[PDB]
Design a protein around this nucleic acid. Structure first.
Ligand SMILES: [Mn+2]
Ligand SMILES: [Mn+2]
Ligand SMILES: [Mn+2]
Length: 368
RNA sequence: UUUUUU
C-alpha cells in the first residue's frame, strides 16, 4: 500500500515521450477466435465525396443491427490476446520485452482523462506485479451497453459509431474490392464482433509501456514487412459544429481522440460530421500531432496531460516489483480528486488466469 | 462504439 494515493493535479516537469514502436498485432472475434500476428481484421479507409453526396444516414439499419459484442459472453478486459502476441514477439528475441507496464491503451487513456474531465468511475482496474513488471486490466468483464430502445438517442449514438465504420471502411484495398461491394455499403449489415489490434512499445518519462490498442483501419497503404503505426487511422463521429456549445463539445472530442491516438503513435484521424438527424454532412482529416496546436487556438491541455501521464506512470511504477512481489494484487481507482491503489487478498484472482494466465507465467520462467 | 465541465 506504500504510495496509496496520487492527487489529480500532480504533474511531472518532464514532457519526454518515447517514439512508439509496433511490436505485433492480432485479429480477434467473439467466440474466442484469436489470431496472433494476423491482419485479417485490419480494414482500409475509403469514403469518396460521391458517397457523401448521397446523404448517408448513420441511423439506418439500427433495428437490424447484430450487436455481437453485446450478445457475447466474454471477458472484455482480458489481457489474453495481448499477452499471447507479446509472448510470440519475445519468443523471437528469446527475451522478455523491456517495459514497466503492460496494458490496453483504453485503460491508460481513462487514467489520463480522469484528471481532465473524465469520469472517476471509469477508472476501475487491477494491477498485478510479475517478473519486474505491472499488468493492468479493466476489472469489468463486460462493457456497459445501452439498454434503451433502438430509436433512442442513446442507442443511435452508440450504433452510429459502428455504422460510420461500415460506410467508411473496406475489408481490402479499394482496387481489390468488388464494385457491388463499393456501391452497396448502405445495405450491408453492421457488425462489431471482428477486431484488429496493434501491440506497441512506448514511453513517457523514464518509463516504458507495452500497450494493446484496437485499430480502425489503414489510411493509405500497409507495409507487410514494416511498422504500420504511421499508416493507421482513427475514425470518429461528431456533431457538426454550429454553436458555441457545439464547439466546446468538439474541442473535448478532439482532446480525447488525441489522447486515444498519441498514446500509440497513430497519426491519422478522420472525423465524420453529422447533423441532429444522424445524417453525415462531411468528413475532415486531422493529424494527431497537429491537435495540440489546434487546441492552443481555442489551452495548454495537451502538455498538462503529458505531465499528468508521466506522474501517474512513475507513481504506478513505485509499486514493489522484485522477485518476492510476484502475484501481489491491487485495485486501482479514482475518487475524491485522487487516484487510489489498494492491495488485495483474493487468492482466486491472483492464482487464476483472470490477469496473468499460467501459460504466460510458465513462459516467463522458461526465460530466467 | 457511446457518454464524460475538463
Ligand atoms: Mn475493425
Ligand atoms: Mn476503434
Ligand atoms: Mn474510431
Amino acid at each position: 500500500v506504500f504510495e496509496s494515493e496520487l492527487l489529480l493535479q500532480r504533474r511531472l516537469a518532464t514532457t519526454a515521450l518515447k517514439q512508439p514502436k509496433e511490436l505485433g498485432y492480432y485479429s480477434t472475434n467473439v467466440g474466442g477466435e484469436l489470431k496472433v500476428m494476423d491482419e485479417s481484421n485490419l480494414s482500409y479507409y475509403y469514403l469518396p465525396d460521391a458517397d457523401i453526396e448521397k446523404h448517408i444516414d448513420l441511423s439506418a439499419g439500427a433495428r437490424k443491427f447484430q450487436d455481437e459484442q453485446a450478445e457475447a459472453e466474454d471477458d472484455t478486459g482480458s489481457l489474453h490476446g495481448l499477452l499471447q502476441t507479446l509472448m510470440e514477439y519475445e519468443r523471437r528475441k528469446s527475451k522478455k520485452v523491456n517495459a514497466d507496464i503492460i496494458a490496453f491503451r483504453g485503460q491508460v487513456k481513462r487514467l489520463i482523462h480522469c484528471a481532465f474531465g473524465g469520469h472517476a468511475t471509469d477508472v476501475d482496474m487491477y494491477v498485478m506485479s510479475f517478473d519486474g513488471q505491472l499488468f493492468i486490466r479493466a476489472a469489468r468483464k463486460k462493457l456497459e451497453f445501452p439498454t434503451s430502445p433502438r430509436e433512442s438517442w442513446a442507442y443511435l449514438a452508440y450504433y452510429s459509431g459502428y455504422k460510420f465504420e461500415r460506410m467508411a471502411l473496406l475489408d481490402r484495398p479499394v482496387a481489390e474490392t468488388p464494385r457491388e461491394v463499393l456501391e452497396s455499403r448502405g445495405k450491408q449489415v453492421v457488425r462489431n464482433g471482428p477486431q484488429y489490434k496493434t501491440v506497441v512499445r512506448t514511453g513517457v518519462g523514464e518509463h516504458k509501456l507495452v500497450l494493446g490498442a484496437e485499430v480502425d483501419g489503414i489510411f493509405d497503404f500497409r507495409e507487410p514487412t514494416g511498422d504500420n503505426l504511421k499508416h493507421y487511422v482513427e475514425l470518429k463521429v461528431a456533431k457538426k459544429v454550429q454553436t458555441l456549445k457545439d464547439a466546446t463539445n468538439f474541442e473535448q472530442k478532439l482532446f480525447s481522440v488525441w489522447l486515444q491516438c498519441f498514446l500509440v503513435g497513430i497519426n491519422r484521424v478522420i472525423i465524420g460530421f453529422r447533423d441532429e438527424k444522424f445524417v453525415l454532412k462531411s468528413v475532415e482529416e486531422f493529424s494527431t500531432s497537429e491537435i495540440p496546436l489546434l487546441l492552443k487556438s481555442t489551452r495548454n491541455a495537451c502538455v498538462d496531460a503529458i505531465k499528468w501521464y508521466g506522474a501517474l506512470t512513475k507513481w504506478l511504477c513505485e509499486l514493489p516489483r522484485g522477485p518476492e512481489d510476484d502475484f501481489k494484487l491491487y485495485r486501482l481507482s479514482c475518487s475524491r480528486g485522487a487516484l487510489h491503489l489498494r492491495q488485495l487478498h483474493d487468492e482466486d484472482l491472483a492464482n487464476g488466469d483472470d490477469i496473468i494466465p499460467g501459460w504466460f507465467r510458465e513462459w516467463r520462467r522458461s526465460l530466467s
